[PDB]
Amino acid sequence: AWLLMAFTALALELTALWFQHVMLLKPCVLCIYERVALFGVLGAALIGAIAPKTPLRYVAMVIWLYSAFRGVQLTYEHTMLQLYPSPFATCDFMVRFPEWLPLDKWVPQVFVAMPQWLLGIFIAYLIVAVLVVI
Amino acid sequence: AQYEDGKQYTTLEKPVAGAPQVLEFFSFFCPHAYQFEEVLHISDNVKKKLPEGVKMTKYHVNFMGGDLGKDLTQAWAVAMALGVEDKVTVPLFEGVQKTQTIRSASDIRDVFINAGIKGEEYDAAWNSFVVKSLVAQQEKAAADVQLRGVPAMFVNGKYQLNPQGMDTSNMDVFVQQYADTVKYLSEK
Ligand SMILES: COC1=C(OC)C(=O)C(CC=C(C)C)=C(C)C1=O
Ligand SMILES: [Zn+2]
Numbered sequence: 001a002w003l004l005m006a007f008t009a010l011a012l013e014l015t016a017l018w019f020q021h022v023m024l025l026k027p028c029v030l031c032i033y034e035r036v037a038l039f040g041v042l043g044a045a046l047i048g049a050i051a052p053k054t055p056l057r058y059v060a061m062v063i064w065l066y067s068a069f070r071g072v073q074l075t076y077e078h079t080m081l082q083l084y085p086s087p088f089a090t091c092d093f094m095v096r097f098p099e100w101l102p103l104d105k106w107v108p109q110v111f112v113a114m115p116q117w118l119l120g121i122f123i124a125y126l127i128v129a130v131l132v133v134i
Numbered sequence: 135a136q137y138e139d140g141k142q143y144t145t146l147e148k149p150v151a152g153a154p155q156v157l158e159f160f161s162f163f164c165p166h167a168y169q170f171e172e173v174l175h176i177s178d179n180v181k182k183k184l185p186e187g188v189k190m191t192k193y194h195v196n197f198m199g200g201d202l203g204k205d206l207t208q209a210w211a212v213a214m215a216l217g218v219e220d221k222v223t224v225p226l227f228e229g230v231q232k233t234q235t236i237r238s239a240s241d242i243r244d245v246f247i248n249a250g251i252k253g254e255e256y257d258a259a260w261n262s263f264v265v266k267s268l269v270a271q272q273e274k275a276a277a278d279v280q281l282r283g284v285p286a287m288f289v290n291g292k293y294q295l296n297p298q299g300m301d302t303s304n305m306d307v308f309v310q311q312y313a314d315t316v317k318y319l320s321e322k
Contacts, residue, residue: 081166085166085168085169086166086169087166087167087169087170087173087174087176087285087297088166088170088297088298088302089165089166089167090161090164090165090166090167090170090283090284090285091161091164091165091197091198091283091284092282092283092284093197093282093283094282095282096282
């Protein structure tokens, strides 16, 4: 089951990290939110959970759970706010991240040199969390 | 007592000595906050609860539009420098989306004149010592309490409320809740 997500992770890890390079940095924050979540959960899955294709097999559900939860809410949010400008909402950059956890943005993001579409992928991947369980 | 830190005000890590009693960092363009001050006029609705007579302050931020951000900052500082902040505030605030003046200095200035103020004042303030001190004061003010780039009103040494901590079920009364936290921090 590892290679199953690794194929997309290998390409998705890079592809996601690809189309954000020379294309012209174009940094933000909410951007880093899905990126740190997208990479964290996809990795946590292959990097670990997605490996025991035979026992209790259910370590990934928790990992996938977080993927979309954040994903769906990272997709279905600021985006809607954009056409319905609301007070609490505003602009931002970088965004803090206590509990140490090295760089996080100071590198995962800046370590390089229309996103609306991105919204559909996560919203879709959401159901993948349930079916994959087996 | 059902009321505690976390879902009312964000607890900073270090206050800024000598900093204004109540200071708001906002932008003239980019944030949805446009409604914050233009629609809910929170800075205005909230000032109405002035406790004991605490004075409020308004600051602009440097992000977005590199030079434009900084340029608008001077403009805002120029406003505070003339003392004619309230009058030009809205016209210039509303001047961004509803007039689209985001251009050069001489342009950004032109609308400033249009706000019903005489140029003889704006001219001196364009570079005067007072203005230079004010533009820097912004950045500094923000930097002392690490902003990030969002609308937030901090209270004398105290912290700013958590807009996401409160509730959003009464766009109207929301000011009261927004204003209940500020009042408390002022003398408590
Ligand atoms: C809203 O935040 C994001 C972007 O906006 C600047 C992106 O461009 C990208 C990358 C864009 C492409 C076309 C791969 C991602 C992944 C993202 O989360
Ligand atoms: Zn109105």
